[PDB]
Swiss-Prot record:
Organism: Oryctolagus cuniculus
Residues bound to heme: 405
Official protein name in the record: Cytochrome P450 2B4
Family designation: Belongs to the cytochrome P450 family.
Primary enzyme class: oxidoreductase
GO MF term list: arachidonate epoxygenase activity; heme binding; iron ion binding; oxidoreductase activity, acting on paired donors, with incorporation or reduction of molecular oxygen, reduced flavin or flavoprotein as one donor, and incorporation of one atom of oxygen
Amino acid sequence: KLPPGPSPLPVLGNLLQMDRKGLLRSFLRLREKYGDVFTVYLGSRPVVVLCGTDAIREALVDQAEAFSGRGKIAVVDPIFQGYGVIFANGERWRALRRFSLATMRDGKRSVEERIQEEARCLVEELRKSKGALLDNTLLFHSITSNIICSIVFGKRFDYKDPVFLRLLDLFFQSFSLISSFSSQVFELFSGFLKYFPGTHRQIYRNLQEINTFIGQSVEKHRATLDPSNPRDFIDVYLLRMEKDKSDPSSEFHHQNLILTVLSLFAAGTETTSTTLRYGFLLMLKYPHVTERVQKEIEQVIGSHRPPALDDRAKMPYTDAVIHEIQRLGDLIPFGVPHTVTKDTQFRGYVIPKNTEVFPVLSSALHDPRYFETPNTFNPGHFLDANGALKRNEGFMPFSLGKRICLGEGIARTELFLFFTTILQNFSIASPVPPEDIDLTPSGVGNVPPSYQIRFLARH
Ligand code: HEM
Ligand SMILES: OC[C@H]1O[C@H](O[C@H]2[C@H](O)[C@@H](O)[C@H](OCCCCCC3CCCCC3)O[C@@H]2CO)[C@H](O)[C@@H](O)[C@@H]1O
Ligand SMILES: COC(=O)[C@H](c1ccccc1Cl)N1CCc2sccc2C1
């Protein structure tokens, strides 16, 4: 009645059949024996696992709603308690997404321009290093955050700013701890381990502190608010609160505002950052690729005017590189968890309503049916015989269906504009030779090795 599962022990679950190397590696080892769709016991609760493009499409697109439910991540659930855009369910999630999607769609300068602007800052910043060795971590987390900040707070912060950097520091320290092997162990046995000291308490304090600053910004916004002339996501949300003053059954209250703003930073910054970081890592290893991208820039955009999003349709090779950067990136390898909305019928099995489903986004991105060389950087994977962009059914790095990444538009806009703007202005080099670069990296999120890079100016 459930997908073929290994014989679990009570309380402990399928522990003894896991691999020590991490969940993901645990899931892929099982897939070998138990097929494309199986069941594993993470403690006392079971979860359906989906491997391969088809299984994920069959569930998330074809049974879109059935698989529209959100699961908890034990290490952050104390913070979120099922409020906010990412971790809400039912009406709470629907109303909020409907609100979020529409609102981002709008300093009165469109999302494109704010990203173009942010890119100019980065270009001005990178010149100052005047060719020095640098670890692009801090810069990349900083630019992506400014976009979210510009959407929700209605401003951006300088890179040298001390206070910005500290909240930022502890924000990304939280993720690194969420992706830790310790957070994965916590997922299995949280019910026992929440009374012990562990990384979960550090994650709890780091985030609660971020929320404090968010709250303060809400108040300051509320005190300065001009209803006739809104400025950002919060200003808007505030006016929808006043609108719904009469209704207690409404979802638009304080607690949802806070965890939503937290949610936007949680999703909007970390993955977008690591992609650029992985991208340049890859671009250091393959000079022949970057030369081509720079050549494609020289022909279409030139060495003068900055890149616009319009330019992408005319730049199929760069776009394909970015596609392949995201493919190999594999930054969310088994995805944000899902749950079923009703007792669902799937491939002849019965997934009882409320059963967690792990759509393994890694297996899709390395699917040999869709990608000739699944373990090699191959921009060809996305280029037809005429050298034009071709989409692929295995390319689902933003997942699929009703839960599809809400910021896909914004994310891709950032990748393209950031890559083309940096590379238009700087050639790249590093202490490590291309042949000696190793890419293999962690848990819920992938995090590739930290590296050092020179951003050499061009003129
Ligand atoms: C290129 C970088 C990004 C990648 C690779 C990425 C990927 C993903 C993935 C895999 C999910 C899980 C969807 C699911 O299975 O439920 C997700 C969810 C989400 N993403 Fe992103 N994302 C990126 C950037 C962004 C940005 C920039 C934003 C907004 C500023 C954003 C907003 C969201 C939200 C709100 C969710 C939760 C959706 C829901 O449960 O309703 N993401 N993203
Ligand atoms: O000492 C007071 C002065 O600083 C204020 O700037 C603020 C800012 O307005 C207030 O925005 C700030 O909070 C800012 C930090 C940005 C964190 C945003 C995200 C970063 C990464 C992801 C997590 C959160 O604290 C600073 C206060 O030190 C004031 O606005 C100034 O006018 C002033 O003279
Ligand atoms: C849609 O989900 C997220 O955006 C991620 C996410 C969840 C699970 C695995 C990978 C990722 Cl990137 N959040 C989860 C909670 C927090 S707190 C500070 C940052 C994040 C990142």
